[PDB]
Amino acid sequence: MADLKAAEVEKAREHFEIYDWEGEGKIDARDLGDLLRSLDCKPTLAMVKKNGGSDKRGEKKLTLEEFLPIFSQIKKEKEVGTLEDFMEGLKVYDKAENGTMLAAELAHVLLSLGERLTDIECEEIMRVCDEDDDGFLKYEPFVKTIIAGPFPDEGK
Amino acid sequence: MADLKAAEVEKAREHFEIYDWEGEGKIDARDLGDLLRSLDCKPTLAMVKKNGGSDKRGEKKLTLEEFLPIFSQIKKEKEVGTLEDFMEGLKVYDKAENGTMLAAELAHVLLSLGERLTDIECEEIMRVCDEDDDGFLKYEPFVKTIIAGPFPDEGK
Amino acid sequence: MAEDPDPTEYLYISMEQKRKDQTKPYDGKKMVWVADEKEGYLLGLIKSTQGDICTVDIEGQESRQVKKDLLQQVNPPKYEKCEDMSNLTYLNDASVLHNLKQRYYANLIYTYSGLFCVAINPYKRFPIYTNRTVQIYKGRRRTEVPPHLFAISDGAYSAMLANRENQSMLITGESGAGKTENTKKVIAYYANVGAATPKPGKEAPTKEKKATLEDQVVQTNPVLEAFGNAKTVRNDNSSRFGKFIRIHFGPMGKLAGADIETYLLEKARVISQQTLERSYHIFYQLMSGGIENLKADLLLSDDIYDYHFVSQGKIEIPGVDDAEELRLTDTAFDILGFSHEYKTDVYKITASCMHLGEMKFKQRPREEQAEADGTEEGERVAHLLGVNAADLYKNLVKPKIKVGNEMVTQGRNATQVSYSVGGLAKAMFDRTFKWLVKRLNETLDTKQKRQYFIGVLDIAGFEIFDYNGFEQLCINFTNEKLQQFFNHHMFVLEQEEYKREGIDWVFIDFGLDLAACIELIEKPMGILSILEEESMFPKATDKSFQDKLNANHLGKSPNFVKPKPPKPGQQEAHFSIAHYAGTVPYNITGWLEKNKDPVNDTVVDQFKKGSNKLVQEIFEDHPGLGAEEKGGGGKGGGGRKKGASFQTVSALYREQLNRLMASLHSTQPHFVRCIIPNELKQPGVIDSGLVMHQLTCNGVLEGIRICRKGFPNRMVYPDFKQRYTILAASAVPKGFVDAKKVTEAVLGAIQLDANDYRLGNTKVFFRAGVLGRLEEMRDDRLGKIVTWLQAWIRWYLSKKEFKKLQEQRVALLVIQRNLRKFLTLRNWLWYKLYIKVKPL
Amino acid sequence: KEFKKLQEQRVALLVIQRNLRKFLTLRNWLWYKLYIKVKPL
Amino acid sequence: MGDEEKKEKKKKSKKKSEEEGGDAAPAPPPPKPPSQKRRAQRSGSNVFAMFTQHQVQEFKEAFQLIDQDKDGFISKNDIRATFDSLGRLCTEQELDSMVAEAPGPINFTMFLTIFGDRIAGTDEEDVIVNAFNLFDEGEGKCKEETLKRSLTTWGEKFSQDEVEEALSEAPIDGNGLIDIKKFAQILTKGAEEEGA
């Protein structure tokens, strides 16, 4: 958890600034989805659609000034999650005794649990090693490129 | 083909500037035949003389106006892609019809009868067709290969 | 969840019992199954036991003194309202019988019988079209995936993809199971493993747009079915012929294509009919189904009994039309990439094989020779070939019979004349179909993915009528060899694979022979037959046929019914040969005339010939099949070899027959033993008498003795460790290691009950029951870490595949930091460029 | 097939004809060439 | 960051080298962690000799703006002020560039370590592909003509003169000026036209 504090406001400004590109400070409706996810409220797709979001093309533009009186509600009941949990979890599957993961196999176990993986996301889990021999991930560089985000900004 | 088309005139105005090395017009006598061959009309040297044209160097030369009655006589007669005496003109050493004739009598009969052309082309009528060791080489596919053509239509 | 899978596709169980440890103390004994004298097994009670002898009464109303081993102790609730029937270890006919009855009651059709399954096939189709299906057969639980043929195909794909060496799935059966109807559900697993590219706006829908290879692999089975399938009334949708299908699977399991050859085809189901045989399915399709365009040109009626080789209406089996089945197949040409031309040209030749029927005893003269007073009848044949009514009505009436090698005729009366009209049709239909598969096979040689296959062998048809053709006989001489791959895989290759893997099992092989006198090499098989290799000439005796049969087929075959010959003239002798199905009274004559041909090579061959040569390619390239080397002599063709040979394509089919059989011999078994449930081919009806009979010939005792440890689920031990998820640790693996007695710890760590596991360090092996439903409850329990990976994969996808909000932004801001001052920053204090500047 | 080599020559003939005129025009209007050798300053 | 915000954190971010007066504020907000400063300034350190050349004349071309006096040692901000507006061509914002190519007053004596401090400067050496490259969706090197593009369509807005000038003044290598050369600009490849 956490209440309204300077650190969260920064987290939200940072994700938002990635999510634009126009340089106009406007993000579309759908991007509310993954902003909130990155903030570690752990929403479901229901929570997104509740906030007039979308899993389709945008409909309208949001400024941060709209987004934040949504967000200060969202924070209540959340877990910021640990990292070490996903490592321990994904060590369970092995394929060399080294924490290595065939791509199809890693999509499938997610599919068949939880709220259940969509057609598209199993293609994304698969995407890395697509259509060759299938196709081995490793748990540590997997989790890490996901959480870090692929270029939140770099100095190189 | 069996009649002049409007695009074969539009093709021939373009290809007029090729024939005269200046980029003007005046159809060269060998390039008389190259224009009829890039418009689906492929007479013999004895059919050329009937239309009153040319297909080889040293023969009459004409202008594009003068080319239209010559071009129109081939359309009324054979060789615009019609079938008769092509793959109907081959075989007489076999009283069997298996769609085959002898290898030896499919490369020195075009050289001992016919208008007589290159030994390399005598080797293409043998190459397009199947080979067996029973002495049976087909005659009927090399002709259909010509129906397929570089361009079935108007060359460019 | 609540420990039952969620219906979407039909026939999913909703359980009462759980196949877990409770069921184990139930086993026998009070009631047992005694054998009826009228065929079948029914339920008896032991009234008194005199030691090793017993007196077990029957509901037949007999009292019978029986011997221990015969009376099967009653099968416990492990096969009542469970997904299970994989755990079978119970012997003889009855064990299986009870359990399949209770399978219908349990809302299912196909079930495991160990590794060597039993399939009870009525044919029904669950929707495949849903975006629901392409998650379900994209791998899920062992009861989200039902114990239908999709399961085995999961555990083949999972097997193959873990251990990196090849498998097969080999279906046997008899007339009363339509092999092909089964195979399309194997393919429907494969074809719906697919997923599609991300949508840019985060759209979950997509898929049913991918992919023409999967589509192709399906579609070919309707094309193959319309020509080769006819029907019976014991076997609705009877494939009477033989096809070998190698299906190829990708990295992700996605179908890559199918190299499909064809073995034989009938020339005896359209030369005349036996009572309650229907001719080839396509005729009726074409007739009922036809659009107004083709109806005009092809000159078709939708009325029957205006023919004689096309008689018998619709036969009731679910999910088959003739009319709607036309549109399916017409599309199935379109999809293959076949030519829009060649469809109608082929239809013209196809539809004359209807038209031909109703002609007999045409000695009425027009020209001082046997022709006919008919017109319309033969004009509707005539136009579609080109040749006129006279070419037709001359050449029908009698064959030019090679006698010595010269040409004579016989006197032929009404029936004789009838049978010779049917000749012209069967030569056309065989020869078109034979061109036809092979030119469609070319296009299906694209792979472009991993080179792993399963080869599915479908050689069916058998038939039990007073007359079957010589064509069907050569098909059933393969059927014998199928029962030998059973022997070779049920004893041998099953436990060779168990040994390699190091899975537990005492390695014991029992004796059983169902044939062993046949060789899987050409040269023995092509001493046979004198009704082949000398029949085209009148030197062929039916006597020597049987003699050469009795050496090569009989010695190690047991269910083989001997030839007793009627010594006068030409045989009406009967024999029969081993198969899972009964005794066949054969008629031996007429086999003669068919390879002296009732309507010759020559007569057919000239419809093949063209007039622009485009016509020719459609049927031939030019050596043989419509063009002729001439002369008398030779076997086979066509007109190689040589001339009017009078066809003997059955000998050519020794050669090739070696080539199909031997590779398939060496492949490691998945098996489906397709049993006739009932004749009407309908869910909730099964006959005891049929199944009792099929299983005694399919050596059911032996067939459970090895398969008492049957495993037809085989996956990855990591994968299954991961589906339960293990967050407790004291000593619990996360390692890729043995499951011998280790599977009890990675279950029991956090919750779960355990009843089924087996050793594995590459492939892990399961049987049905305990796994699946407990893994649906892990959807309900697993909150937290699992579902937050899933939300994180949503955040992954969305960030990458927006396509402009991705890594575009970081670059664009640094790009800007230069753009604000681009005039300044592209130089410095000292201008150093004097090298290559547009004016400087 | 060879007429293809000649078909791209139809526009090329129009370029050499203007260029031959410019072979004499720029020889009355020189100081329009100068390229690397040893003479530049 | 809302509409209004990204106006403010041009002027407020401003993480060196970006702390410059601008064209209408300097660079568009880098995201909240200060990783990207390194692409705001790169700096090396090789000194190159003065009077070794005969394109050495160049220092006399710059001179007047950076040496009002005839033996220099003028005021210390005047390099940071005037040279911005027409020295190494027009439009001011050369503040931190100038304070990082001169380490105090520039004159003919001091010239060794400005010629040298060119190679330290801002966005000099420390060559890296990814910086501009990741724009065009990581597909091919990201050069001149796509930067011009971006300035009229997306991103924060700045004075259009500088860009049209900069394209025209290009040397041309044929794929324009890649990210490599955008850094490595000190060693080969510069500008044309007015100034310094």
How are the secondary structure elements laid out?
The structure is cut from a larger assembly and holds two copies of chain A (156 residues), two copies of chain C and one copy of chain E (196 residues).
Chain A: H1 6-19, E1 27-28, H2 31-38, H3 45-50, E2 61-62, H4 64-74, H5 84-90, E3 100-102, H6 103-111, H7 119-127, E4 136-138, H8 139-148
Chain C: E1 31-35, E2 41-49, E3 53-57, E4 63-67, E5 72-73, H1 94-105, E6 116-120, H2 133-136, H3 150-163, E7 170-173, H4 179-190, H5 212-228, E8 242-249, E9 255-262, H6 282-289, H7 292-297, H8 323-334, H9 340-355, H10 376-385, H11 389-395, E10 401-403, E11 406-408, H12 414-441, E12 452-459, H13 470-501, H14 522-525, H15 530-533, H16 542-552, E13 561-564, E14 574-576, H17 602-608, H18 614-617, H19 649-665, E15 671-675, H20 688-697, H21 700-705, E16 713-716, H22 717-724, H23 743-748, E17 763-766, H24 771-781, H25 784-801, H26 808-819, H27 822-825
Parallel strand pairs in C: 6-15, 7-15
Antiparallel strand pairs in C: 1-2, 1-5, 2-3, 3-4, 8-9, 8-12, 10-11, 13-14, 16-17
Chain E: H1 5-11, H2 37-40, H3 58-62, H4 95-98, H5 112-115, H6 130-133, H7 144-153, H8 160-168, H9 179-183
Helix pairs in contact in E: 7-8
Task: Give the tags.
5 chains, A: 156 residues, two-stranded antiparallel ribbon, 4 strands, globular, E: mainly alpha, 9 helices, 0% strand, motor protein
Question: Could you explain how this protein is built, in words?
Answer:
- This is part of a larger assembly, with two copies of chain A (156 residues), two copies of chain C and one copy of chain E (196 residues).
- In chain A, the strands form two sheets. A two-stranded antiparallel ribbon of chain A has the order 1-2.
- Chain A contains eight helices and four strands.
- In chain A, helix 6 (103-111) packs antiparallel against helix 7.
- Chain A has 156 residues and is mostly helical.
- In chain C, 36% of the residues lie in helices and 10% in strands.
- In chain C, a hairpin with a 3-residue loop joins strand 2 and strand 3.
- In chain C, helix 6 (282-289) crosses helix 8 and helix 10 crosses helix 11 (389-395).
- Chain C starts with 30 loop residues before the first strand and ends in a 15-residue tail after the last helix.
- Helices cover 27% and strands 0% of the residues of chain E.
- Chain E is built from nine helices and no strands.
- The chains are: A mainly alpha (156), C alpha+beta (840), E mainly alpha (196).
- The interface between A and C is large, with 72 and 74 residues.
- It is classed as motor protein.
- The entry lists the keywords myosin, thick filament, insect flight muscle, motor protein.
- The entry is titled "The interacting head motif in insect flight muscle myosin thick filaments".
- Chains A, B: Myosin 2 essential light chain striated muscle.
